[PDB]
Amino acid sequence: MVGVTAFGNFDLASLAIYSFWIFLAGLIYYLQTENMREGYPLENEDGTPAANQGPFPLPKPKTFILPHGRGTLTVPGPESEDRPIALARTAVSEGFPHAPTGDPMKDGVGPASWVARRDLPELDGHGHNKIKPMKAAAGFHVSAGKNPIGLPVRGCDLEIAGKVVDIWVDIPEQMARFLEVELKDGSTRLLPMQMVKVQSNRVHVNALSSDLFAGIPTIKSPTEVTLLEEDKICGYVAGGLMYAAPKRKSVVAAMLAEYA
Amino acid sequence: ALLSFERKYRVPGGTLVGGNLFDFWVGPFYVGFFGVATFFFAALGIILIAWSAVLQGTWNPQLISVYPPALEYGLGGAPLAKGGLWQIITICATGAFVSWALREVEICRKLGIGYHIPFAFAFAILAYLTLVLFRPVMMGAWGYAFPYGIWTHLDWVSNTGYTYGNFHYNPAHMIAISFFFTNALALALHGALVLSAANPEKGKEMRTPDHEDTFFRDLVGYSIGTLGIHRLGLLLSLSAVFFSALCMIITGTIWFDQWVDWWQWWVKLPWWA
Amino acid sequence: AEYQNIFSQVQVRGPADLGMTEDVNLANRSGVGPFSTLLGWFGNAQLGPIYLGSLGVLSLFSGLMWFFTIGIWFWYQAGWNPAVFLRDLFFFSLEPPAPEYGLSFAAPLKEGGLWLIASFFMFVAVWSWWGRTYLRAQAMGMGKHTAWAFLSAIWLWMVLGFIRPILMGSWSEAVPYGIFSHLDWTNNFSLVHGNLFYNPFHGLSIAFLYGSALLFAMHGATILAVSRFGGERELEQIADRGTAAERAALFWRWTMGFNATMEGIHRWAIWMAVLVTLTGGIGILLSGTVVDNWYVWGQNHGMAP
Numbered sequence: 001m002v003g004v005t006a007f008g009n010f011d012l013a014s015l016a017i018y019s020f021w022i023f024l025a026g027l028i029y030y031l032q033t034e035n036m037r038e039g040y041p042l043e044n045e046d047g048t049p050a051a052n053q054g055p056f057p058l059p060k061p062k063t064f065i066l067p068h069g070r071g072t073l074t075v076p077g078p079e080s081e082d083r084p085i086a087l088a089r090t091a092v093s094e095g096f097p098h099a100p101t102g103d104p105m106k107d108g109v110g111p112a113s114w115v116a117r118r119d120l121p122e123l124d125g126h127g128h129n130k131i132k133p134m135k136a137a138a139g140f141h142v143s144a145g146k147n148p149i150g151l152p153v154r155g156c157d158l159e160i161a162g163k164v165v166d167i168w169v170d171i172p173e174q175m176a177r178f179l180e181v182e183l184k185d186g187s188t189r190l191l192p193m194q195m196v197k198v199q200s201n202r203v204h205v206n207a208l209s210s211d212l213f214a215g216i217p218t219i220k221s222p223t224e225v226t227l228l229e230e231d232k233i234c235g236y237v238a239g240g241l242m243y244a245a246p247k248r249k250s251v252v253a254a255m256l257a258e259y260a
Numbered sequence: 261a262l263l264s265f266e267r268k269y270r271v272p273g274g275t276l277v278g279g280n281l282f283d284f285w286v287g288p289f290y291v292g293f294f295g296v297a298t299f300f301f302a303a304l305g306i307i308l309i310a311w312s313a314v315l316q317g318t319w320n321p322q323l324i325s326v327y328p329p330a331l332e333y334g335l336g337g338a339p340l341a342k343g344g345l346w347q348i349i350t351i352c353a354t355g356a357f358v359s360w361a362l363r364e365v366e367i368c369r370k371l372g373i374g375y376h377i378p379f380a381f382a383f384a385i386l387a388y389l390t391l392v393l394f395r396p397v398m399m400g401a402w403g404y405a406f407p408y409g410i411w412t413h414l415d416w417v418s419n420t421g422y423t424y425g426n427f428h429y430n431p432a433h434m435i436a437i438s439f440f441f442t443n444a445l446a447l448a449l450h451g452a453l454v455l456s457a458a459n460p461e462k463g464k465e466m467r468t469p470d471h472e473d474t475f476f477r478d479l480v481g482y483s484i485g486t487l488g489i490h491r492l493g494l495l496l497s498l499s500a501v502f503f504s505a506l507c508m509i510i511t512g513t514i515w516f517d518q519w520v521d522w523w524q525w526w527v528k529l530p531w532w533a
Numbered sequence: 534a535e536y537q538n539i540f541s542q543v544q545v546r547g548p549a550d551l552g553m554t555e556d557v558n559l560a561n562r563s564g565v566g567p568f569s570t571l572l573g574w575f576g577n578a579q580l581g582p583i584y585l586g587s588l589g590v591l592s593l594f595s596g597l598m599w600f601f602t603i604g605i606w607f608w609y610q611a612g613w614n615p616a617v618f619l620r621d622l623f624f625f626s627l628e629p630p631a632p633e634y635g636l637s638f639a640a641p642l643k644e645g646g647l648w649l650i651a652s653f654f655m656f657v658a659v660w661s662w663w664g665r666t667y668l669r670a671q672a673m674g675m676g677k678h679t680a681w682a683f684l685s686a687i688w689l690w691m692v693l694g695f696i697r698p699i700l701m702g703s704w705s706e707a708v709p710y711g712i713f714s715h716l717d718w719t720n721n722f723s724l725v726h727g728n729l730f731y732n733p734f735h736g737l738s739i740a741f742l743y744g745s746a747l748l749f750a751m752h753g754a755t756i757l758a759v760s761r762f763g764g765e766r767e768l769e770q771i772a773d774r775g776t777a778a779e780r781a782a783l784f785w786r787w788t789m790g791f792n793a794t795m796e797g798i799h800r801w802a803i804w805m806a807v808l809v810t811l812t813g814g815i816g817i818l819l820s821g822t823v824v825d826n827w828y829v830w831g832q833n834h835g836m837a838p
């Protein structure tokens with residue numbers, strides 16, 4: 001013996017592997033279908049019908065019931081983005097990049113875009129709110145270490161837009177998700193923690209510029225910050241990087257973006 | 261592709277040297293300078309490989325490969341069959357890689373995200389290069405590397421593995437294997453951890469963050485939150501890949517004769533016989 | 534610096550409140566463990582709600598015992614003098630029955646034995662730890678998954694030291710305890726079963742093992758880059774997807790031409806991370822029993838140089 005066998009050198013071990021690739025090949029198929037719940041339904045438009053196409057190995061749904069009085073959601077993307085975008089053609093073959101119809105950031109298109117998202121504060125385990133201002137919660141306390149509260153936030157150009165006032169924290173997961181900037185006009189605006197550096201001497205926002213600051217879309221409400229506003233602040237904050245430094249392109253290198 | 265949402269975000273930018281020219285989604289893909297500079301730098305590798313094969317034998321997937329120049333064949337990029345095809349598959353390949361790597365920085369950049377994946381990728385290159393152009397260059401014989409061939413590159417692994425005894429005993433392997441292992445643990449756990457939440461027992465509520473964070477606390481007696489585990493994500497697996505490469509670059513040189521004899525030092529220290 | 538999201542920028546800590554009361558008989562969760570600045574710099578400073586309960590205790594008892602035995606069984610012959618125990622901790626196995634009595638628990642002290650007793654308790658420990666994972670999953674929701682995923686692991690564990698030896702009609706094939714030695718049994722297991730790299734299963738297992746380090750290096754990588762506005766918080770997005778998702782989606786749709794999203798990313802991941810053991814275990818159950826000298830099998834099919 002050297003591997004017992006059935007019909008023509010096809011052993012019990014041989015049986016095992018043909019069977020494996022017989023159904024795993026199917027697994028990929030399933031999870032790939034399951035993977036395209038969103039997006040993939042409607043990339044075709046009825047200005048003219050189908051002779052071109054819209055892929056459809058697409059699955060049969062179920063419904064995510066949102067705990068918080070939220071409701072029921074069917075994710076197979078019945079998507080109709082009802083918002084506007086400032087963009088238009090630059091040639092007729094769809095792969096070509098198609099320009100912003102006048103500055104992005106103010107109306108968000110390109111790398112600095114936000115998106116509609118049920119205009120209500122994020123789910124906590126408890127019905128309570130999630131992200132809540134440090135100046136308003138049961139004992140949260142950065143101890144002896146550099147809480148940026150009394151130092152000027154500063155962008156690319158100058159430190160003349162930098163009254164830091166209070167950290168803005170996530171209550172369950174204990175993380176400081178926001179720094180609050182009382183802009184030179186008593187306007188509190190927040191910034192996404194990751195995109196700013198806190199040197200024990202100043203807060204550097206290599207993300208944006210001294211200006212462009214007084215634009216981060218106001219959280220029009222004092223305490224409750226939220227999606228339509230949360231995806232918006234980060235969105236316009238991102239508008240630095242690509243669209244900030246006037247220099248519309250440039251080879252790069254390690255240390256702070258080209259510096260000065 | 262056309263990925264519905266895509267529509268908006270499809271704008272110019274990025275590009276390290278492809279200025280404005282050479283940045284148009286060839287269908288679902290993104291042709292950028294490096295995008296082409298991969299394809300060329302790549303294909304000229306497939307052609308070189310495909311042909312080189314038509315001078316040694318059978319037109320078969322699982323039966324060719326690529327052996328470097330002999331051992332004391334010096335170093336100097338010798339013949340175009342007795343190991344030079346390798347050096348022209350490598351410079352071609354290594355390049356193709358480095359390109360796709362930085363290509364990501366391009367695409368990544370023009371979408372506001374952060375140059376973070378290629379970093380995690382630069383470790384895979386750091387790996388390859390150790391056992392192809394680092395370990396070999398050390399002791400001159402550009403044979404100590406490995407032949408690109410499917411069923412035949414497993415053989416190098418063994419023929420060099422046992423050249424040192426039972427490689428197991430070799431250090432790095434040990435702690436490096438630990439992270440490779442522990443990678444699975446992580447994901448496996450994170451792999452259920454949200455699908456469990458996202459999908460709870462029948463007509464119940466979509467168990468949210470807190471529950472993830474409790475369950476684990478409520479089992480291991482700890483949970484690292486939601487950013488926490490996606491941190492380990494690199495560190496665990498990636499450090500594995502780093503540590504793995506130590507496993508070899510050292511063996512050649514820092515220590516020659518058979519392992520099982522290193523760990524013999526602890527076994528002897530004065531006080532202990 | 535922190536412009537790349539690795540270690541945390543600022544240290545906010547608050548009142549450690551116990552947490553969830555959902556069905557879970559709150560009566561067993563402990564009080565509050567220490568907070569920790571160090572672990573804090575990574576992702577979450579707390580000790581937390583260790584819930585010492587019913588079937589839990591049972592596990593750690595058997596486990597600490599499975600341990601104690603091997604310890605005593607280390608000690609008992611180990612030139613006792615606790616000046617060497619440290620030294621020869623490594624080369625120190627206490628291999629299962631050497632001679633073949635067959636699966637006969639009537640194997641004594643020296644000539645094996647060890648195993649039966651010890652192995653008995655480890656057999657419970659893990660199974661009782663499989664226990665937890667289900668009841669503790671049932672106590673709120675948490676589908677089942679985190680338990681069902683472990684079955685895969687517990688499977689090869691049983692195949693490697695329980696099922697297979699039961700098919701050769703002999704425990705000797707038992708991947709016994711000790712450090713250095715399990716490491717060695719593993720080597721000539723292949724070098725008697727014909728250079729294992731030739732086996733279709735140990736081969737797919739390594740491909741899948743390697744595949745997991747890849748997928749987590751990717752998920753992780755994709756996230757801290759996208760962690761500028763919500764990527765970090767995965768579920769809410771499987772219910773209301775902002776640009777963390779969308780932007781993270783494009784990235785791949787561009788680089789490689791097709792991508793996942795949220796539920797899908799981890800529905801892919803669990804599978805690719807579980808299969809490592811599943812698949813890998815199947816092949817280890819075929820070696821020996823239904824196939825000696827692997828290479829041959831391969832040689833009949835194609836497995837060429």
Ligand code: BCL
Pocket residue numbers: 428433434435437438439441442445690693708712715716719
């Ligand atoms: C998979 C194929 C072989 C095999 C091949 C190898 C090879 C090859 C190696 C190991 C190594 C290891 N194996 Mg093994 N091993 C096998 C089966 C097993 C089984 C089992 C079947 O039940 C166990 C319990 C182990 C256990 C171990 C560990 C002792 C060790 C690191 C694993 C790890 O970090 O886990 C994952 C991690 C965790 C669960 C997190 C915690 C880590 C724990 C479990 C162990 C820490 C041990 C050490 C690093 C620290 C001790 C500190 C003290 C203060 C001294 N192996 C099978 C039969 N194993 C490696 C080693 O370096 O050992 C010396 C090594 O090189």
Ligand code: BCL
Pocket residue numbers: 321322388391406410411413414417730735736737739740741743744747
């Ligand atoms: C130190 C580790 C060793 C090594 C040790 C092993 C061992 C051990 C095994 C393999 C196995 C494999 N190795 Mg290896 N392998 C090494 C380096 C490489 C390199 C390289 C770029 O350096 C490549 C491309 C491969 C590729 C492969 C696979 C084709 C095969 C399963 C891959 C896998 O891990 O699943 C993960 C894979 C993915 C997630 C994606 C697939 C990877 C790509 C697409 C493969 C491309 C094939 C080729 C480049 C096509 C050229 C043209 C054709 C010849 C006509 N190896 C190094 C040198 N490799 C396994 C095998 O042979 O069994 C089937 C196996 O058991």
Ligand code: BCL
Pocket residue numbers: 417441596655658659686687689690693719720721722723729730734735736738739740742809810812813814816817
């Ligand atoms: C050395 C001789 C062989 C060889 C022989 C073997 C043998 C023999 C085996 C493997 C197996 C494996 N081999 Mg090999 N293997 C070789 C070379 C390789 C190479 C290589 C790059 O050269 C690679 C990448 C691999 C990779 C692998 C893995 C894919 C695979 C499964 C291991 C695992 O993930 O965890 C393994 C998983 C477990 C141990 C799960 C069990 C966990 C338990 C339940 C934990 C309990 C904890 C306990 C109660 C308490 C202690 C812990 C406390 C915290 C203190 N092998 C060489 C040629 N390989 C295994 C297999 O069959 O897969 C195909 C196996 O048995």
Ligand code: BCL
Pocket residue numbers: 384385387388391417418420421422426427428433436437440501504505506507508
């Ligand atoms: C078999 C005899 C010896 C042995 C000898 C050796 C030797 C010799 C080496 C290893 C090495 C390794 N061993 Mg070993 N090993 C043994 C037993 C073991 C066991 C075990 C359980 O038995 C394990 C788990 C391991 C595990 C490992 C790994 C930790 C490590 C490779 C990691 C890696 O990513 O490489 C990093 C490289 C890659 C991941 C390849 C990436 C290639 C590039 C960058 C990308 C390719 C893309 C591709 C071309 C795209 C094509 C796609 C198509 C276009 C679609 N070994 C014993 C038994 N081991 C290796 C090592 O030290 O580390 C490398 C090594 O050299």
Ligand SMILES: CC[C@@H]1c2cc3[nH]c4c(c3C)C(=O)[C@H](C(=O)OC)c4c3nc(cc4[nH]c(cc(n2)[C@@H]1C)c(C(C)=O)c4C)[C@@H](C)[C@@H]3CCC(=O)OC/C=C(\C)CCC[C@H](C)CCC[C@H](C)CCCC(C)C
Pocket residue numbers: 441444445448449479592593596597600658659660662663666679680682683684685686806807809810
């Ligand atoms: C899906 C991928 C595979 C997998 C999956 C997996 N493992 C798992 C799970 C899953 C899904 C769990 O849910 C389960 C778990 O809950 O942990 C996450 C677990 C688990 N996987 C484990 C290990 C493990 N998994 C491994 C691998 C894998 N696990 C695969 C990759 C490995 C490898 C291969 O190395 C190991 C080592 C366990 C830690 C844990 C379940 C263990 C358990 O049952 O515990 C019971 C009790 C004990 C073992 C006793 C503990 C001993 C003491 C700590 C010693 C102290 C002794 C001292 C004498 C006392 C005090 C005196 C002092 C002087 C010391």
Ligand SMILES: CC[C@H]1c2cc3[nH]c4c(c3C)C(=O)[C@H](C(=O)OC)c4c3nc(cc4[nH]c(cc(n2)[C@@H]1C)c(C(C)=O)c4C)[C@@H](C)[C@@H]3CCC(=O)OC/C=C(\C)CCC[C@@H](C)CCC[C@H](C)CCCC(C)C
Pocket residue numbers: 298301302303305306349352353356357360377378380381383384407408409410413497498501743744746747750751754788789
């Ligand atoms: C931290 C290191 C870990 C890692 C990370 C990682 N890998 C990555 C990435 C990341 C983050 C990517 O972004 C990149 C990717 O896009 O895929 C996800 C990638 C990648 N990891 C890959 C593979 C891979 N990674 C592995 C491992 C790892 N990757 C580590 C565990 C492994 C194994 C099994 O360990 C493999 C097989 C690729 C899928 C991909 C990067 C390569 C790439 O896609 O390049 C595109 C190339 C071409 C279209 C053709 C160019 C080359 C050819 C024309 C051939 C030229 C000659 C040839 C190279 C000779 C060698 C032949 C071999 C048979 C030996």
Ligand SMILES: COC(C)(C)C/C=C/C(C)=C/C=C/C(C)=C/C=C/C(C)=C/C=C\C=C(C)\C=C\C=C(/C)CC/C=C(\C)CCC=C(C)C
Pocket residue numbers: 600601603604605607648649652653655656690691693694695707708709710711712715
């Ligand atoms: C008390 O000791 C002190 C503290 C003083 C000192 C220290 C002691 C130490 C550090 C001891 C260490 C022990 C170690 C490190 C042990 C390591 C063991 C390892 C690495 C084991 C590896 C693999 C083990 C395997 C695969 C075991 C498998 C076991 C089984 C599959 C069980 C099979 C099932 C059986 C016997 C029962 C079946 C059913 C019935 C009803 C009987």
Ligand SMILES: [Mn+2]
Pocket residue numbers: 450490752767799
């Ligand atoms: Mn995740």
